């Protein structure tokens, strides 16, 4: 019954092709609810879930003002990081920021986070105490010194423990039909010969929410993790998720193999069998 609110920012430079493109998205759990795209015509924070549409004009104006301000700072950051790393303008670079808060089943604060990456690598992250920073290299130590002297952590901690949690709870209530639901996976296994002597066994989970799930194969009760092909959990497009796991086995041995599904929607974990 645990929940999260997260915001994700990506800014990408495009040398000699204009200013950087900035995209921001916001999620409650695995449900997107807002977006902003600096290239788009509207120049507005836009709704992406039905339950956020009821927020009033002060909300949309304020969310737009804040995200535009972040768009500009991440533009400046791409410049700053080229300076920190002595990089040229021959190539494109990427800054990412992610932040948000988690609450438990009882909706009380669990933990907060705020992390930044440059070119796909950790750059600087707020520690669990929300008071101190982890800087991944020497350039990020420069940022750490500046953020310590500017008391950035204190600002974030007040947001993460306060405002973040309060608005997460508001969204959970307003979007309760979507966000408080659990859709248990509909499960089955498929069998297809790959030759006269081997078969692919594929364990499916469909139509589930939230996206967290575990699918595993056992052979006589022993986990077959090195022999399993496990695909990334994927969106169906309707607010639910899908996932599969496959093993290739000698024909005749199917009854040794079982698939095991764990999900919060299931009253008990399922074991699927070939007998």
């Amino acid at each position: 019954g645990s929940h999260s609110m997260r915001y994700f920012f990506t800014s990408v430079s495009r040398p000699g092709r204009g200013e950087p493109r900035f995209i921001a998205v916001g999620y409650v759990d695995d449900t997107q609810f807002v977006r902003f795209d600096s290239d788009a015509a509207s120049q507005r924070m836009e709704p992406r879930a039905p339950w956020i549409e009821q927020e009033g004009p002060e909300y949309w104006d304020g969310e737009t003002r804040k995200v535009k301000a972040h768009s500009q700072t991440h533009r400046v950051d791409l410049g700053t990081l080229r300076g920190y790393y002595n990089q040229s303008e021959a190539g494109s670079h990427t800054v990412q920021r992610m932040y948000g808060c988690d609450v438990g089943s009882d909706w009380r604060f669990l933990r907060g986070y705020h992390q930044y990456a440059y070119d796909g690598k950790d750059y600087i992250a707020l520690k669990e105490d929300l008071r101190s920073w982890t800087a991944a290299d020497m350039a990020a130590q420069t940022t750490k010194h500046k953020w310590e002297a500017a008391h950035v952590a204190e600002q974030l901690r007040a947001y993460l423990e306060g405002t973040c949690v309060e608005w997460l709870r508001r969204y959970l209530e307003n979007g309760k039909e979507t966000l408080q639901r659990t859709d248990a996976p509909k499960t089955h296994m498929t069998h297809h010969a790959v030759s006269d002597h081997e078969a692919t066994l594929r364990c499916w989970a469909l139509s589930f929410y939230p996206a967290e799930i575990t699918l595993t194969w056992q052979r006589d009760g022993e986990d077959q993790t090195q022999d399993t092909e496990l695909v990334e959990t994927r969106p169906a497009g309707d607010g639910t998720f899908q996932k599969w796991a496959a093993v290739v086995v000698p024909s005749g041995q199917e009854q040794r193999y079982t698939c095991h599904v764990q999900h919060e929607g299931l009253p008990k974990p399922l074991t699927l069998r070939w007998e």
């Binding site: 921001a24 969310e63 804040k66 995200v67 301000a69 700072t73 750059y123 500046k146 600002q155 608005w167």
Partner: peptide, 9 residues
């Protein structure tokens, strides 16, 4: 609701 203070790397 996002945070509203800004900072630079």
């Amino acid at each position: 609701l996002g945070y509203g203070f800004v900072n630079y790397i």
